[PDB]
Amino acid sequence: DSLRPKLSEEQQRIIAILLDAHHKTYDPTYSDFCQFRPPVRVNDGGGSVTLELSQLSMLPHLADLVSYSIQKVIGFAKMIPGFRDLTSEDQIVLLKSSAIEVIMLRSNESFTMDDMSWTCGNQDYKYRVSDVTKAGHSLELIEPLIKFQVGLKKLNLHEEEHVLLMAICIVSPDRPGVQDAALIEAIQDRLSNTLQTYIRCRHPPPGSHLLYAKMIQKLADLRSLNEEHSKQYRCLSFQPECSMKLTPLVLEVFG
Numbered sequence: 713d714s715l716r717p718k719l720s721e722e723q724q725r726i727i728a729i730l731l732d733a734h735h736k737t738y739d740p741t742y743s744d745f746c747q748f749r750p751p752v753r754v755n756d757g758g759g760s761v762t763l764e765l766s767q768l769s770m771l772p773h774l775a776d777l778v779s780y781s782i783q784k785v786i787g788f789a790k791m792i793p794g795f796r797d798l799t800s801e802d803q804i805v806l807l808k809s810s811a812i813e814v815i816m817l818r819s820n821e822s823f824t825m826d827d828m829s830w831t832c833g834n835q836d837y838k839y840r841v842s843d844v845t846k847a848g849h850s851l852e853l854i855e856p857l858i859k860f861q862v863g864l865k866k867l868n869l870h871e872e873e874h875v876l877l878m879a880i881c882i883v884s885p886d887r888p889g890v891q892d893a894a895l896i897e898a899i900q901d902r903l904s905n906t907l908q909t910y911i912r913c914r915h916p917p918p919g920s921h922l923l924y925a926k927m928i929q930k931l932a933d934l935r936s937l938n939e940e941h942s943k944q945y946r947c948l949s950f951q952p953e954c955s956m957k958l959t960p961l962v963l964e965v966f967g
């Protein structure tokens with residue numbers, strides 16, 4: 713039954729543009745991480761919230777990593793076909809509302825099921841759940857985040873699908889404050905059609921089975937993680953002197 717229309721010339725170009733955009737904005741060697749404020753891991757085997765908030769030992773490093781990542785995501789977004797056709801206001805609304813979700817998606821590349829960490833170098837740049845608690849977050853965010861990373865890993869996405877998913881995540885017409893939802897939807901549909909077509913024509917079985925719907929579900933999971941992250945960030949920001957441990961960009965995007 714299922715027809716397999718071939719990718720159009722345009723669709724092939726969209727894929728190539730997104731792959732190039734990602735390769736220019738995601739360094740798989742994590743060579744810039746030593747430039748961030750250093751990671752510090754206080755002794756907290758008991759997971760004390762009082763101690764974690766008192767020290768926020770991993771916050772400067774993780775805030776720098778997230779801030780750096782937001783800058784890369786802004787650059788990636790600017791290369792998404794159609795993104796620059798949007799008004800500046802809609803572009804900023806889309807970037808601010810998707811930032812954390814795209815960070816969670818793109819981070820899957822360093823996440824490894826070998827030990828359930830984001831491995832970005834030697835021990836210094838190996839990030840574990842215990843590091844996230846040392847940055848002021850709790851299990852309500854961490855648990856679903858790790859579950860999401862593993863679920864995404866097991867989809868065994870082609871790089872083409874991974875970059876398309878990030879682009880679709882950014883160009884979402886259902887974000888609060890967007891003006892031209894119709895144009896945003898048109899841009900997203902062009903990307904979704906490219907993704908659906910790619911899966912049916914280039915993704916071998918059995919990993920291709922209902923893969924599109926699995927990818928769409930991950931976009932829904934991301935909305936939930938976004939909301940929880942926002943709630944936790946708000947509370948984290950109540951800690952006196954927290955602003956110094958963050959960055960101006962992080963403060964704007966999540967404040």
Ligand SMILES: C=C1/C(=C\C=C2/CCC[C@]3(C)[C@@H]([C@@H](C)CCCC(C)(C)O)CC[C@@H]23)C[C@@H](O)C[C@@H]1O
Pocket residue numbers: 771774775777778781815816818819820821822823830832839844847849941945962
């Ligand atoms: C960033 C990237 C990477 C890892 C992501 C991680 C591991 C550390 C903790 C992070 C950054 C989680 C955060 C929710 C931690 C809290 C952030 C904050 C303090 C601002 O509220 C989400 C994704 C997680 C590394 C590399 O893949 C580039 C990528 O781009």
